[PDB]
Amino acid sequence: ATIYFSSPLMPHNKKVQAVAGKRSTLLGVAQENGVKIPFECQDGNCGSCLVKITHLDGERIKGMLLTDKERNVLKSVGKLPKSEEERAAVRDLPPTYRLACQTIVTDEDLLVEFTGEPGGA
Amino acid sequence: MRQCAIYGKGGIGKSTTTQNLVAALAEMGKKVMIVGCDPKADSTRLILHSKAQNTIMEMAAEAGTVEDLELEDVLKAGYGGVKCVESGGPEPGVGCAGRGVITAINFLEEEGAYEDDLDFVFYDVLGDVVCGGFAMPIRENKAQEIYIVCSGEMMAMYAANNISKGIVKYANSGSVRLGGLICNSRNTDREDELIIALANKLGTQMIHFVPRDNVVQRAEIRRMTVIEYDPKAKQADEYRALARKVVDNKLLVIPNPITMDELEELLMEFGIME
Amino acid sequence: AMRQCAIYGKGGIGKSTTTQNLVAALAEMGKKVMIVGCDPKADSTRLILHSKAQNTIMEMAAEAGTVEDLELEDVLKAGYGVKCVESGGPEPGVGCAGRGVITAINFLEEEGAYEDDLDFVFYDVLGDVVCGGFAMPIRENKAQEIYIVCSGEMMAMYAANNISKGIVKYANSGSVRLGGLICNSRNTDREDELIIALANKLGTQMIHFVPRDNVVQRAEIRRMTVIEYDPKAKQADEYRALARKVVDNKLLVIPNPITMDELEELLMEFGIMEVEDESIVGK
Amino acid sequence: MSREEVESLIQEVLEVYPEKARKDRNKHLAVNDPAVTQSKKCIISNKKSQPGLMTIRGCAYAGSKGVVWGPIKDMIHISHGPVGCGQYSRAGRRNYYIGTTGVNAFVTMNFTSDFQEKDIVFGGDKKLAKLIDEVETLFPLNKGISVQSECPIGLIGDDIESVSKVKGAELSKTIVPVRCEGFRGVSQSLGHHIANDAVRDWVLGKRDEDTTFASTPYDVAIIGDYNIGGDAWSSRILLEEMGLRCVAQWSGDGSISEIELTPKVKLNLVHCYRSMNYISRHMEEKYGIPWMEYNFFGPTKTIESLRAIAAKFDESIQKKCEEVIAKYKPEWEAVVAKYRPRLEGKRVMLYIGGLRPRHVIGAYEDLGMEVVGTGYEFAHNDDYDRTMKEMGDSTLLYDDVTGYEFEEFVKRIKPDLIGSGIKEKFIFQKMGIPFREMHSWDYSGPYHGFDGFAIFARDMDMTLNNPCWKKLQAPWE
Ligand SMILES: Nc1ncnc2c1ncn2[C@@H]1O[C@H](COP(=O)(O)OP(=O)(O)O)[C@@H](O)[C@H]1O
Ligand SMILES: Nc1ncnc2c1ncn2[C@@H]1O[C@H](COP(=O)(O)OP(=O)(O)O)[C@@H](O)[C@H]1O
Ligand code: ICS
Ligand code: CLF
Ligand code: SF4
């Protein structure tokens, strides 16, 4: 799995290959590769690791489970429209916004954007 | 059904003046809503008579999630007319400090606590920095009317300017408008006509000038409002007059943000700073 | 050869003057110091550069399109033998208020301004609410020693408690420690021993007590530090002693959180707030 | 009837749970209103099971290996991890097929990586590569390999994608790495989705160049029929008698060649919408292949589906469909005439995994039974919108029902027949209530088509009207 990290804080987007389905989440692959995404909790409630996820290969989209904690934190930041919630509940499709500490790496190429700010502007 | 918000620097009597305004609004047959976004949950202390109202997010986290949260567990009506809700805030350094407002207001519309019995809904938002949840009521157009609490201190004027910039930025999104300026008084000279002049250059009106009085501290020890403590107190009549001008205020304008140098010029011409 | 320092506390405390007069006393020492104003007001360099206001980093970014094209010399201005930068805040209501902080320090680290050519580095940071960018130095271990400018006001107590909670939160993955508190007088009878009490309960010491002096405005009118104005005045001696003990602070302790119930009692003990009782709640 | 009695029943059932469990479970029980089109305002589906409530849901590995990938015969499926997972899923499902075991077919055999402590500590990539090599040497005839990951594979962080690519390049063989860890997802639905995604991202893309196949305006691909007891064969013969040509069967008696040839098909007939709607949608989006849902449970549903199926082609297919209907009419007429009077008026509740509760109401209603309660373990909201119309008014609807719950509703309702899985057959059989295994047809079948309808009616008369049900109570009690 290829990941492309992009941010205004980083002069250049970083490309790096990741192992899909590791118990360590995208938070781990961010830490091992010298990319800093603000992290402020170990229980997945702060929401400071909110990021934009884009799957460049639209055909290769992998189903996943949107857990209730991630759902509620996305509601707490507000980055969860009703239609995205319904789509994730029915078709098991990922939403555009994710949390770096709760998103699992899937076998595809992904682009992750962040502003360096905690979730919620 | 009008929605209002107190914006301003902390410690300028936002919670106290707001709560006394609520006490004044309760008696003339009006049912009103109060929620405070201040991270310290002291915005509903005087009405509810509780030592500290259990805020939304604390008992949402203890109950696992906000879905397992009941409206009755947070919607406490210390007085018959008015109900009281506290948004709360996270631990310092844990995420954005304004998402508590997000969750509180979202849950409030989800359970429909705004139904068929509301005359005024009034929020107490920290106006030191408008960002995230603090800037939110400007953004989704939830609060139609905004009132700014200020004093003669320069940081109060700068905070009011930041509020003006924020509302100007989001004027086209909705009917968010500045209904006027209310200024509490510290024991310093040449104050009321100052804030009047700030309103004059802001394009807005000055609502009322509330002074510093002794009865407020006694009410603080009592944990009941001045109007509930001493209805004959001149400060109680002052709060009643303030409330009746809020109800009878008609003009809602788009403010004009003011630069640093002109603010400084007013400050030196009044001599508040050298 | 770098000691990294942060100045914290509520807004309207008077910390920004404290930082600039403190930096000027280090200039008399001849220490090469850095001042970074991480405050949206963008005024923490007025009394050093004799200017109206330093042009912050994001104004350079907006006039130049991107931050990368920015040169070091326009951002950093050398006055009183000390170099100055200012971060500021974005337009109020969009994004994070501390965003520029993230824009500033990172860019500094990118341009080599943080390389060890200075004795001391200070960040004057608004500490009213602990938020991303405002808490970024505590998190990314960019400020080794933290000092709180706290007055005898309830708000100052609450802000100091929140900052100490932040430091103790990041007190396991970094060397961010709290040196002590600095007291700026608000003409209160019992404020000095009050902040003494919270220093003791917090597990730390007082750095100094700053008295309310009228010469501060007389120095501000020319946009200069009190040290340059009247080096023979007593306020200059107070700031010099504060600088000497700032250099000589060896107590960098992990603070102890204090409950709000105890904060209420501490204000009641120093007589600032009257004696509350449960049988006098209904009238 | 007695809708008020139903909601009072669910209130009196939900009291024993604590506040969290009670509040969560109250969203998963409802009274059917056929006028409702959006079930989201009446029933909540696809949620995590409450801990410690004796749930019936499986794992994603069950939904992928034991449901989708397993029926394929010419490929070898490797349970990557410990020993229990494959062992409990070995030949426990009656996905019938034709072939020779251990030589050219490997459905009813268990391939596992046999993980031990060192495998967990150090990793299983090299062991997986050696296992792939040993599979190639011991089994030359097989057309391909799939590697189903289990919970430890995902938890310890092995790279099965890289080893799959490397070994497939080395041996010129199709290796499909599928990540179906049991903790992934709340039920078998995510297993279905993961298996579908793996099928899409490996097999479908394996050949796009080939055109050597001769197509026909009458190419139809069966989707989501697993030949449980021979269901897919009956559906296929019914289709071929109508004049069409069945190219692909997914996945009962399914072959990898059929899977690869499927995109060259004029029309897709999806049987199980839940398990295989994702691939149907992907096919429609990419190849422009139209797909639609058909039901082959009971004569009425079979006739309706056959007519709708013939409606998509020229008049010759419609004439052949009418000929088939006329030919097969007397058989099911005789079956109905024989069995309906013995079967008239009985009430039945159902609880099966997905789309089976809604598919078989027609067969029950044809024989005079009525469904009073139904529900699903893992169906989403769309299946509920589809099934609300097919059920009568004031009937029971449940999602992820628990053992205590289901026991209380059956005790109060007192039906005459209950169709559910093995895990409830013997808890309900000791209460003196007839029970039918609705998953494996109780080692019988098939139930599709008229031939399977005859089996269905015979088995239901056999189970319901048995003397053993009259002797549960001692004569001296
Ligand atoms: N009209 C008044 N007269 C005297 N004191 C006042 C008046 N209004 C506010 N205050 C004082 O201002 C302080 C600010 O209180 P509060 O509103 O709770 O904090 P904040 O202003 O941060 O919301 C209170 O301690 C109160 O004693
Ligand atoms: N040592 C002092 N003695 C008297 N007044 C002071 C002193 N320090 C600051 N002040 C006053 O406090 C006011 C605001 O302080 P400032 O430094 O702007 O606060 P902040 O640190 O929040 O920016 C100034 O106008 C100044 O006159
Ligand atoms: S695939 Fe599914 S549990 Fe759709 S996992 Fe399960 S052979 Fe059931 S209700 Mo066994 S979603 Fe098929 C099913 Fe239905 S194994 Fe069979 S009967 S129609
Ligand atoms: S939910 Fe699914 S079936 Fe369960 S383990 Fe997980 S992948 Fe598998 Fe097999 S091995 Fe035994 S039974 Fe489990 S405990 Fe470890
Ligand atoms: S948006 Fe405001 S409240 Fe939120 S983290 Fe940034 S500064 Fe703090």
Ligand code: FES
């Ligand atoms: S680190 Fe707090 S939610 Fe991810």
Ligand SMILES: [Mg+2]
């Ligand atoms: Mg307050």
Ligand SMILES: [Mg+2]
């Ligand atoms: Mg300042």
